Symmetry: C2
Subunit: 198 residues, 2 copies
């Protein structure tokens, strides 16, 4: 729907300037041409608009990172392919992530916002798991691999979250590519440790 | 002064009840019995109160984690009982950190808030660095140790940030002690990787 997109485009731009609080549904109308009644019929409220806008930025973020099956064979080893793309996006410091971390830390979340935060978070965790399953030896029993992959995934997600905060709070001195390289090296060392933990 | 602590205690209770937006200086006065003029005279504005409030929360968080020169014998190494305390605090999932992360992701921050967020962040980084310097072999040249410690510290700080979000967004399934244990294991493995360039 093209009418949905103009509302979100208007809201993005309007929130880039002016902030969320100082932006009125009226202001959104002025920008996108859709009447307030029309905006409500779509997203239900002002918070509903931010929710849908947040979810859109997510899909664009994730679509720029290839799934394991979308990368090639292995080359360079192909978990590396994903890492390269993740590094690329993260090095550009996406403001989408700023919003995600902000909204996930807010008390009294709007139900629509809470659902979107939950889904984006689950997708992120899923995308990491998709990549990390292929880092384990072929001969691990499925139940054991599940445990190890899960614990490795939580570790990767945690480090990746912290990389954004590094890039945010230490933008001048933070090397994103280097930090993610340490993660890949950390994961490689942890795999034997986890497999033999009884 | 006792006057400052009553304002902050009252503000602490008001946000977590009505939240920051729905709380007024008048509400703060009603709770602590200090006139708005007195409150302004201390913190200058409503944002000034929030700043001082969460900075207080930071000091209580850090004072509960021993530095290297506290945390006595043996020389263990000492980062284990440091880690134990860090795990203990994080296991309780303090709301201080939620506020820190929230204020750190905001644009158009009040000047007082920005200064406090930066100080808390620098203090955290410094406390990690203080502990991690002792994980290296002693025969490492000071300049190389500087780089390795700094890179290890940023890694630890990053993981430790991620642990809070795991505890916050996956509270049922997140094992905090186990995560921080992986970190210590990760750091130890990374220590030679970094030294050999
Ligand atoms: Na908001
Ligand atoms: Na606020
Ligand atoms: Na520590």
């Amino acid at each position: 729907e093209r009418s949905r997109e103009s509302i979100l485009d208007a809201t993005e731009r309007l929130m880039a300037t002016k902030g969320y609080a100082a932006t009125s549904i009226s202001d959104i109308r002025d920008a996108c041409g859709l009447a307030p009644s029309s905006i409500y019929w779509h997203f239900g409220s002002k918070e509903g608009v931010l929710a849908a806008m947040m979810e859109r930025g997510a899909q664009r973020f994730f679509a720029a990172i290839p799934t394991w099956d979308e990368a090639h064979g292995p080359v360079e080893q192909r978990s590396e392919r994903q890492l390269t793309e993740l590094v690329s996006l993260q090095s550009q410091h996406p403001d989408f992530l700023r919003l995600f971390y902000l909204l996930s830390m807010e008390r009294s979340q709007d139900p629509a916002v809470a659902a979107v935060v939950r889904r984006v978070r689950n997708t992120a965790i899923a995308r990491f798991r998709d990549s990390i399953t292929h880092l384990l030896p072929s001969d691990i029993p499925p139940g054991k691999a599940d445990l190890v992959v899960a614990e490795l995934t939580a570790f990767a997600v945690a480090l990746s979250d912290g990389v954004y905060f590094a890039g945010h709070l230490e933008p001048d001195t933070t090397d994103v590519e280097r930090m993610y390289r340490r993660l890949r090296q950390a994961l490689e060392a942890l795999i034997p440790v986890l497999l033999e933990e009884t």
